[PDB]
Amino acid sequence: EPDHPIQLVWTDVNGRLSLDLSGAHDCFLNTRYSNYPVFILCIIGEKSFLMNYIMRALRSMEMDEEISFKWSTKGIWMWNRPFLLNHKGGKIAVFLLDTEGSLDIESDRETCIKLSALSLFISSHLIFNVASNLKETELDYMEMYMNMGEECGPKNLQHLDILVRDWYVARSYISREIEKLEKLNSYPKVLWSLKSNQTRCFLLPHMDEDFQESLRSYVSKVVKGICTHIKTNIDGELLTSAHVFSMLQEFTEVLNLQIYGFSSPMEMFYAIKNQKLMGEIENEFQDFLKNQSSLTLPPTMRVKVSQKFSELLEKFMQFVQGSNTSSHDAMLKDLEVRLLEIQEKFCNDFTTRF
């Protein structure tokens, strides 16, 4: 079939994330490039011009030519074939990803956050389209993305480009946003990113030729820096499309299992870490109970299990992340119900057996 965009992920009627497994398999586990170092360019927010220029520039570098089969929706879409760019004596497989979603509509916000989080999780580089100054919801997506690099290798940096489509000077723009963020005292990683030039801002004029040339200039700049921003995984191997297929499956499951309320991307991110912490506590309780002797005096056993139980609820509140207390309360209550099940099983076994 002629190469075309494929919808990788969408949301079903229940807000669950659904993955085209067979489709993603075909793209990512192709025996030609699946062990080539991979690069996932992702576009988010709100284009056809930008996307088509990126493909035209990529297809030129692929055929060893010089930079100077089109792109058409509420999901994650990918161009089903990668562009193989020369690097070392090998190749880099560039996949092109587009996150279609609302940014500010309050309907289906949890699902919008989930789709976007998934794209950001697997991206090597983010192109974020904004209209004028950065709004809070955009900045929160940006902070989530900045946090997704802190768990993907040691010297991993998260690269973000901001395409401001309707500002009215890119110097005054970035300086302005740095000032607003400095007073707000929130979004510390975006602030740091803006000050370290890891986040770049590009201002696009609205007339055709000035927009055309600015897009061309920007697209040339990001395809040229692709080969030097290869991500490495936790192990230290360069990211490959096989790895990306695995990450996509696993983080889709993590997102569908994040069953606690959240109103913002950072809250969804902290909810994911807090659920993990819950499981580290329950496992820690199970281990503690397994190491207790069957010879222990039943009274001394009851007190030790009770105090350990209490200490673990304290530990959940000490290491819980984020500031949504309503969510922490729901999770502690569920942790308490789970710990009491482990306790009831161990204790009821212990009393009747011994």
Query: Other CB atoms closer than 10 Å to residue 261's CB: what's the count?
Result: 13
- Please give the DSSP secondary-structure letter assigned to residue 319: H
* DSSP state, residue 287: H
Q: Which amino acid is at 308?
A: K
Closest CA to 245 of 14, 10, 30, 5: 30
Is 86 annotated in a binding site? The answer is no
Check the annotation: does 345 bind a ligand: no
The response to whether 245 counts as a known ligand-binding position is no
Residue 32 is labelled as binding a ligand: no
* Residue 166 is assigned to a ligand binding site: yes
Q: Which residue has 């879409």 as its token pair? A: 77
Contact 104, 137 (CB under 8 A): yes
Residue 349's alpha-carbon distances to 185, 287, 296, 341, in angstroms, are 53, 16, 14, 12
The reply, when asked if residue 18 is annotated as ligand binding, is: no
Q: Which residues pair with 7 in a beta bridge?
A: 77
Please give the DSSP secondary-structure letter assigned to residue 179.
H
Based on C-alpha coordinates, what's the Rg of the chain? 24
Alpha-carbon distances of 50 from 54, 74, 79, 214, 352, rounded to whole Å: 6, 18, 14, 11, 70
Helix (H) or strand (E) holding 122: helix 109-122
CA–CA separation, 149 vs 35, rounded Å?
22
Q: Answer yes or no: is 334 a known binding residue.
A: no
Residue 165 is labelled as binding a ligand? yes
Instruction: Write the CB contacts of 118 (distance below 8 Å, at least 6 apart in sequence).
Output: 9, 17, 76, 248, 251, 252, 255
Check the annotation: does 72 bind a ligand: yes
The Cα 223–Cα 55 span in angstroms is: 10
CA pair distance 335, 330, nearest whole angstrom: 9
Distance of CA 36 to the CA centre of its chain: 22
Cα–Cα distance for residue pair 116/45, rounded to 1 Å: 9
Residues in the annotated binding site for Mg(2+):
48, 73, 98, 156
Binding residues: 47-49, 72-73, 98, 156, 165-166
Binding residues for GDP: 47-49, 72, 165-166
